[PDB]
Amino acid sequence: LLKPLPADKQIETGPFLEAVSHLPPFFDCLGSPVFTPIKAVISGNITKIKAVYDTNPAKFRTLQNILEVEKEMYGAEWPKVGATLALMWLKRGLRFIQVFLQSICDGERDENHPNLIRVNATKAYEMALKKYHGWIVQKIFQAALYAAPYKSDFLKALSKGNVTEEECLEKIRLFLVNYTATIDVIYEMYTQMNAELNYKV
Amino acid sequence: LLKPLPADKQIETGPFLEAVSHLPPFFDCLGSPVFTPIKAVISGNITKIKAVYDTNPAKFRTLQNILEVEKEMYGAEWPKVGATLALMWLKRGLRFIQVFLQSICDGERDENHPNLIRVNATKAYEMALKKYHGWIVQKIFQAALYAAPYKSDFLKALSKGNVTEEECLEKIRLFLVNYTATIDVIYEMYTQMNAELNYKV
Ligand SMILES: CCCCCCCC/C=C\CCCCCCCCCCCCCC(=O)N[C@@H](CO[C@@H]1O[C@H](CO)[C@H](O)[C@H](OS(=O)(=O)O)[C@H]1O)[C@H](O)/C=C/CCCCCCCCCCCCC
Ligand SMILES: CCCCCCCC/C=C\CCCCCCCCCCCCCC(=O)N[C@@H](CO[C@@H]1O[C@H](CO)[C@H](O)[C@H](OS(=O)(=O)O)[C@H]1O)[C@H](O)/C=C/CCCCCCCCCCCCC
């Protein structure tokens, strides 16, 4: 999965990229081609970070190094540049997933619609993405929501082949431990480096 | 641009991929981040074709060869596989662009809205894509439309740096000659090979 955090909280770029490279395929298990463009955008972020990393894996050994090195490389253009920008967006997608999954695991629901996950996706959107989206992108989110899988198929997909919903949620809870810790460190690094931007798309 | 067609109408894969690789950047000149996911999906098609080509450029020398070789490789799974599938979708995006640009050049408009290009995009959608889109994707198209550039900025973008609208449209008309011929050959090849599918997303 995601390997745990070292004591010094430095996140190794290579292993992080191998971990997150498992993410784009998981989109196809939301069970709708509607999500293909979102898959492609997240893949694009990962590809951009990988392209920078590959130029000098020692110089870009950790995610912290990416921000440090690029700040120096790009001056006034930073942080709206390079792998710093790609990771700024990637982390927002990762945080959306974190909040979404955590919300489902925490029993958050619409009483009247137990085999949907609309309410969980809406909370994740508000906490991770909405701040950076203008009116048009928000309308697109609303449209995409109609394509969201049934809770059961979604859980069946995350386990595909037969486990109970309860067993699946326990597996998701276990995954969430290192996943949340890793995302938290990435957000902290953007904050501490003043690398976070607040422009809307 | 696109190089002209040889007498035997065989389209060389390598040069075709270099030509179409100029396409994803042009999306950014629609002047709205709303189109970034569409850019990424088209880039994905091109990357998939390139990945197949790179395995054996002689075996995949022409687009016709891709379909011929893959039909043999994949049997009952073909044509819903490999570079054949990627090109099936790419050609639909290319045809959308063709019809869109041709519609603008042909003076097609909404009298009441001369600095918009909504009517031209809608015609392109109906002729190239709509057949393969279910209700949700169609609603997404409708949302994306709100982000379409002004006709003037769009034309300014295609020329960026100062030329009249009239000069820009003449340049687009010239481009459309080899572009349309090439797309026509690709559609003909899918038709003649019975490689075209009609499933909806
Ligand atoms: C390690 C991961 C763990 C894997 C295991 C997890 C298992 C979970 C199972 C399934 C996964 C669940 C899927 C849930 C849905 C995924 C989350 C949606 C994430 C959307 C992220 C949108 C980001 C965004 O707004 N992008 C925007 C900005 O893009 C960036 O723009 C920059 C310039 O300003 C740069 O050009 C940048 O490019 S780069 O070269 O610098 O990198 C580029 O990426 C882009 O313009 C807009 C895209 C359309 C907005 C997206 C609409 C949100 C809809 C998402 C649907 C959620 C509903 C799902 C229902 C369950
Ligand atoms: C050589 C080119 C010439 C360059 C110069 C041209 C200059 C022109 C200037 C600017 C460009 C103009 C831009 C106009 C807009 C671009 C056209 C929009 C094209 C949309 C194409 C959508 C295709 C589509 O529906 N895709 C769908 C199917 O994807 C395929 O699914 C397959 C499985 O069934 C495979 O997974 C496949 O992957 S692969 O690995 O096998 O490749 C994958 O690609 C995908 O699920 C759905 C995506 C969302 C639908 C797209 C919504 C349409 C909105 C487009 C906006 C048009 C409005 C623009 C206003 C001007």
Side-chain angles (χ1 to χ4, degrees):
Chain A
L1 322 147
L2 271 308
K3 53 155 74 171
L5 285 170
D8 66 13
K9 310 276 160 259
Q10 305 308 106
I11 296 167
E12 297 179 7
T13 306
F16 172 80
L17 290 169
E18 36 197 327
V20 297
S21 289
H22 289 82
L23 173 56
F26 276 99
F27 279 78
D28 294 337
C29 322
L30 282 170
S32 173
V34 166
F35 304 109
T36 294
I38 307 304
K39 179 184 171 183
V41 162
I42 290 291
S43 186
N45 302 138
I46 297 166
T47 296
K48 174 61 181 191
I49 305 163
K50 180 174 191 299
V52 172
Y53 173 70
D54 286 345
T55 70
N56 197 324
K59 180 160 71 173
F60 297 115
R61 186 169 287 99
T62 66
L63 303 185
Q64 290 85 352
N65 288 340
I66 297 170
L67 276 61
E68 294 158 2
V69 171
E70 291 193 338
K71 178 180 163 86
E72 291 319 293
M73 253 189 252
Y74 297 112
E77 305 300 333
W78 187 89
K80 203 179 181 187
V81 72
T84 298
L85 183 63
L87 178 60
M88 194 189 306
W89 284 100
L90 177 58
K91 79 185 170 80
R92 294 170 181 174
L94 294 179
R95 178 72 91 202
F96 177 100
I97 295 162
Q98 177 203 308
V99 172
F100 179 59
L101 292 176
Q102 186 68 247
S103 174
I104 296 167
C105 290
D106 289 349
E108 285 168 21
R109 71 209 179 260
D110 182 321
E111 320 277 58
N112 317 78
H113 293 87
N115 207 26
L116 307 185
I117 46 67
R118 280 182 40 106
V119 67
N120 311 277
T122 307
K123 181 182 168 174
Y125 183 69
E126 293 164 0
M127 295 187 53
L129 292 167
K130 184 188 176 171
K131 186 174 180 189
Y132 316 106
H133 287 177
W135 178 90
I136 304 169
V137 173
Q138 292 192 33
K139 290 288 161 184
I140 293 160
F141 168 71
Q142 289 167 32
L145 255 184
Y146 308 142
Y150 291 114
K151 188 181 275 185
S152 78
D153 298 313
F154 182 61
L155 299 181
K156 264 144 194 60
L158 292 170
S159 42
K160 212 280 170 191
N162 45 249
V163 328
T164 57
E165 200 162 289
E166 293 78 5
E167 181 178 299
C168 184
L169 296 165
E170 206 84 299
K171 293 298 192 288
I172 296 170
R173 288 183 192 103
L174 184 59
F175 161 79
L176 278 170
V177 177
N178 290 167
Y179 183 68
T180 303
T182 299
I183 302 169
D184 278 354
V185 169
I186 298 170
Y187 272 70
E188 176 180 53
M189 167 193 74
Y190 272 77
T191 299
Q192 297 296 324
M193 302 206 201
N194 196 17
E196 176 73 356
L197 296 169
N198 289 285
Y199 72 90
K200 297 193 179 179
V201 292
Chain B
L1 322 147
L2 271 308
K3 53 155 74 171
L5 285 170
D8 66 13
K9 310 276 160 259
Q10 305 308 106
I11 296 167
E12 297 179 7
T13 306
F16 172 80
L17 290 169
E18 36 197 327
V20 297
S21 289
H22 289 82
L23 173 56
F26 276 99
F27 279 78
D28 294 337
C29 322
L30 282 170
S32 173
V34 166
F35 304 109
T36 294
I38 307 304
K39 179 184 171 183
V41 162
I42 290 291
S43 186
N45 302 138
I46 297 166
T47 296
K48 174 61 181 191
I49 305 163
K50 180 174 191 299
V52 172
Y53 173 70
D54 286 345
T55 70
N56 197 324
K59 180 160 71 173
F60 297 115
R61 186 169 287 99
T62 66
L63 303 185
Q64 290 85 352
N65 288 340
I66 297 170
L67 276 61
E68 294 158 2
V69 171
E70 291 193 338
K71 178 180 163 86
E72 291 319 293
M73 253 189 252
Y74 297 112
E77 305 300 333
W78 187 89
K80 203 179 181 187
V81 72
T84 298
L85 183 63
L87 178 60
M88 194 189 306
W89 284 100
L90 177 58
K91 79 185 170 80
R92 294 170 181 174
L94 294 179
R95 178 72 91 202
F96 177 100
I97 295 162
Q98 177 203 308
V99 172
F100 179 59
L101 292 176
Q102 186 68 247
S103 174
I104 296 167
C105 290
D106 289 349
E108 285 168 21
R109 71 209 179 260
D110 182 321
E111 320 277 58
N112 317 78
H113 293 87
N115 207 26
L116 307 185
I117 46 67
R118 280 182 40 106
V119 67
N120 311 277
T122 307
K123 181 182 168 174
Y125 183 69
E126 293 164 0
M127 295 187 53
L129 292 167
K130 184 188 176 171
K131 186 174 180 189
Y132 316 106
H133 287 177
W135 178 90
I136 304 169
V137 173
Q138 292 192 33
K139 290 288 161 184
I140 293 160
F141 168 71
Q142 289 167 32
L145 255 184
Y146 308 142
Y150 291 114
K151 188 181 275 185
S152 78
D153 298 313
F154 182 61
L155 299 181
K156 264 144 194 60
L158 292 170
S159 42
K160 212 280 170 191
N162 45 249
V163 328
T164 57
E165 200 162 289
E166 293 78 5
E167 181 178 299
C168 184
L169 296 165
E170 206 84 299
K171 293 298 192 288
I172 296 170
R173 288 183 192 103
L174 184 59
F175 161 79
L176 278 170
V177 177
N178 290 167
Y179 183 68
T180 303
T182 299
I183 302 169
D184 278 354
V185 169
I186 298 170
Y187 272 70
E188 176 180 53
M189 167 193 74
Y190 272 77
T191 299
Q192 297 296 324
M193 302 206 201
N194 196 17
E196 176 73 356
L197 296 169
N198 289 285
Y199 72 90
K200 297 193 179 179
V201 292

mmCIF file of all heavy atoms in Angstrom, chain A residues 19-34:
data_model
loop_
_atom_site.group_PDB
_atom_site.id
_atom_site.type_symbol
_atom_site.label_atom_id
_atom_site.label_comp_id
_atom_site.label_asym_id
_atom_site.label_seq_id
_atom_site.Cartn_x
_atom_site.Cartn_y
_atom_site.Cartn_z
ATOM 1 N N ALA A 19 3.316 3.938 -5.306
ATOM 2 C CA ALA A 19 2.050 3.817 -4.580
ATOM 3 C C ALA A 19 0.909 4.518 -5.301
ATOM 4 O O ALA A 19 -0.106 3.890 -5.587
ATOM 5 C CB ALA A 19 2.176 4.338 -3.148
ATOM 6 N N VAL A 20 1.061 5.814 -5.602
ATOM 7 C CA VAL A 20 -0.058 6.573 -6.190
ATOM 8 C C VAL A 20 -0.368 6.134 -7.610
ATOM 9 O O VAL A 20 -1.464 6.370 -8.105
ATOM 10 C CB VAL A 20 0.060 8.127 -6.078
ATOM 11 C CG1 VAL A 20 0.047 8.546 -4.613
ATOM 12 C CG2 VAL A 20 1.257 8.688 -6.857
ATOM 13 N N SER A 21 0.580 5.452 -8.250
ATOM 14 C CA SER A 21 0.370 4.938 -9.607
ATOM 15 C C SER A 21 -0.652 3.801 -9.656
ATOM 16 O O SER A 21 -1.043 3.350 -10.740
ATOM 17 C CB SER A 21 1.695 4.486 -10.217
ATOM 18 O OG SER A 21 2.501 5.614 -10.516
ATOM 19 N N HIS A 22 -1.078 3.352 -8.479
ATOM 20 C CA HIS A 22 -2.142 2.363 -8.348
ATOM 21 C C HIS A 22 -3.488 3.032 -8.336
ATOM 22 O O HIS A 22 -4.521 2.374 -8.520
ATOM 23 C CB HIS A 22 -1.934 1.537 -7.087
ATOM 24 C CG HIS A 22 -0.764 0.601 -7.170
ATOM 25 N ND1 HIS A 22 0.505 0.989 -6.941
ATOM 26 C CD2 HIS A 22 -0.708 -0.751 -7.474
ATOM 27 C CE1 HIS A 22 1.328 -0.063 -7.081
ATOM 28 N NE2 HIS A 22 0.586 -1.124 -7.404
ATOM 29 N N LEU A 23 -3.487 4.352 -8.157
ATOM 30 C CA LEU A 23 -4.720 5.092 -8.068
ATOM 31 C C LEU A 23 -5.537 5.196 -9.374
ATOM 32 O O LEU A 23 -6.725 4.907 -9.341
ATOM 33 C CB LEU A 23 -4.463 6.489 -7.493
ATOM 34 C CG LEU A 23 -5.649 7.454 -7.503
ATOM 35 C CD1 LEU A 23 -6.834 6.836 -6.760
ATOM 36 C CD2 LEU A 23 -5.252 8.799 -6.910
ATOM 37 N N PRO A 24 -4.918 5.621 -10.508
ATOM 38 C CA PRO A 24 -5.757 5.799 -11.712
ATOM 39 C C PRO A 24 -6.640 4.559 -12.032
ATOM 40 O O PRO A 24 -7.833 4.727 -12.271
ATOM 41 C CB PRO A 24 -4.741 6.137 -12.813
ATOM 42 C CG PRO A 24 -3.670 6.872 -12.051
ATOM 43 C CD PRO A 24 -3.543 6.100 -10.750
ATOM 44 N N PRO A 25 -6.087 3.329 -11.976
ATOM 45 C CA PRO A 25 -6.927 2.153 -12.235
ATOM 46 C C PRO A 25 -8.158 2.006 -11.356
ATOM 47 O O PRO A 25 -9.162 1.410 -11.800
ATOM 48 C CB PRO A 25 -5.992 0.999 -11.928
ATOM 49 C CG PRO A 25 -4.648 1.507 -12.292
ATOM 50 C CD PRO A 25 -4.660 2.954 -11.894
ATOM 51 N N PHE A 26 -8.088 2.497 -10.119
ATOM 52 C CA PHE A 26 -9.221 2.379 -9.193
ATOM 53 C C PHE A 26 -10.445 3.164 -9.648
ATOM 54 O O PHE A 26 -11.561 2.843 -9.262
ATOM 55 C CB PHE A 26 -8.829 2.775 -7.763
ATOM 56 C CG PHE A 26 -8.199 1.661 -6.977
ATOM 57 C CD1 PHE A 26 -6.819 1.581 -6.836
ATOM 58 C CD2 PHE A 26 -8.988 0.701 -6.362
ATOM 59 C CE1 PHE A 26 -6.233 0.551 -6.115
ATOM 60 C CE2 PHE A 26 -8.412 -0.333 -5.635
ATOM 61 C CZ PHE A 26 -7.032 -0.405 -5.507
ATOM 62 N N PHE A 27 -10.236 4.193 -10.469
ATOM 63 C CA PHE A 27 -11.340 4.980 -11.020
ATOM 64 C C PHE A 27 -12.281 4.122 -11.853
ATOM 65 O O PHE A 27 -13.490 4.318 -11.815
ATOM 66 C CB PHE A 27 -10.816 6.114 -11.899
ATOM 67 C CG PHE A 27 -10.356 7.326 -11.138
ATOM 68 C CD1 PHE A 27 -9.118 7.340 -10.500
ATOM 69 C CD2 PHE A 27 -11.145 8.469 -11.089
ATOM 70 C CE1 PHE A 27 -8.676 8.467 -9.821
ATOM 71 C CE2 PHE A 27 -10.710 9.597 -10.411
ATOM 72 C CZ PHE A 27 -9.475 9.597 -9.772
ATOM 73 N N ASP A 28 -11.714 3.177 -12.603
ATOM 74 C CA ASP A 28 -12.482 2.325 -13.513
ATOM 75 C C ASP A 28 -13.458 1.428 -12.751
ATOM 76 O O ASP A 28 -14.396 0.868 -13.329
ATOM 77 C CB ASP A 28 -11.536 1.502 -14.397
ATOM 78 C CG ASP A 28 -10.734 2.369 -15.364
ATOM 79 O OD1 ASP A 28 -11.177 3.498 -15.686
ATOM 80 O OD2 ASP A 28 -9.657 1.922 -15.809
ATOM 81 N N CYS A 29 -13.251 1.336 -11.441
ATOM 82 C CA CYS A 29 -14.109 0.547 -10.571
ATOM 83 C C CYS A 29 -15.173 1.401 -9.846
ATOM 84 O O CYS A 29 -15.852 0.924 -8.937
ATOM 85 C CB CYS A 29 -13.255 -0.252 -9.584
ATOM 86 S SG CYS A 29 -11.706 -0.918 -10.263
ATOM 87 N N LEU A 30 -15.315 2.657 -10.258
ATOM 88 C CA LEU A 30 -16.496 3.463 -9.924
ATOM 89 C C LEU A 30 -17.605 3.068 -10.891
ATOM 90 O O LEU A 30 -18.761 3.492 -10.761
ATOM 91 C CB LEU A 30 -16.196 4.956 -10.072
ATOM 92 C CG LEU A 30 -15.407 5.667 -8.962
ATOM 93 C CD1 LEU A 30 -14.984 7.068 -9.392
ATOM 94 C CD2 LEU A 30 -16.214 5.714 -7.667
ATOM 95 N N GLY A 31 -17.218 2.280 -11.891
ATOM 96 C CA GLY A 31 -18.157 1.618 -12.792
ATOM 97 C C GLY A 31 -18.863 2.502 -13.808
ATOM 98 O O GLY A 31 -19.993 2.213 -14.190
ATOM 99 N N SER A 32 -18.199 3.564 -14.264
ATOM 100 C CA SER A 32 -18.788 4.479 -15.242
ATOM 101 C C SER A 32 -17.722 5.252 -16.005
ATOM 102 O O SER A 32 -16.853 5.862 -15.395
ATOM 103 C CB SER A 32 -19.716 5.483 -14.564
ATOM 104 O OG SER A 32 -20.133 6.458 -15.508
ATOM 105 N N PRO A 33 -17.809 5.240 -17.346
ATOM 106 C CA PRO A 33 -16.864 5.918 -18.218
ATOM 107 C C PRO A 33 -16.880 7.431 -18.004
ATOM 108 O O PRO A 33 -15.977 8.127 -18.464
ATOM 109 C CB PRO A 33 -17.372 5.595 -19.623
ATOM 110 C CG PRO A 33 -18.221 4.389 -19.474
ATOM 111 C CD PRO A 33 -18.784 4.422 -18.093
ATOM 112 N N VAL A 34 -17.896 7.932 -17.312
ATOM 113 C CA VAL A 34 -17.981 9.342 -16.947
ATOM 114 C C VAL A 34 -16.718 9.801 -16.196
ATOM 115 O O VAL A 34 -16.288 10.955 -16.312
ATOM 116 C CB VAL A 34 -19.249 9.592 -16.109
ATOM 117 C CG1 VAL A 34 -19.230 10.946 -15.418
ATOM 118 C CG2 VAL A 34 -20.485 9.451 -16.991
#
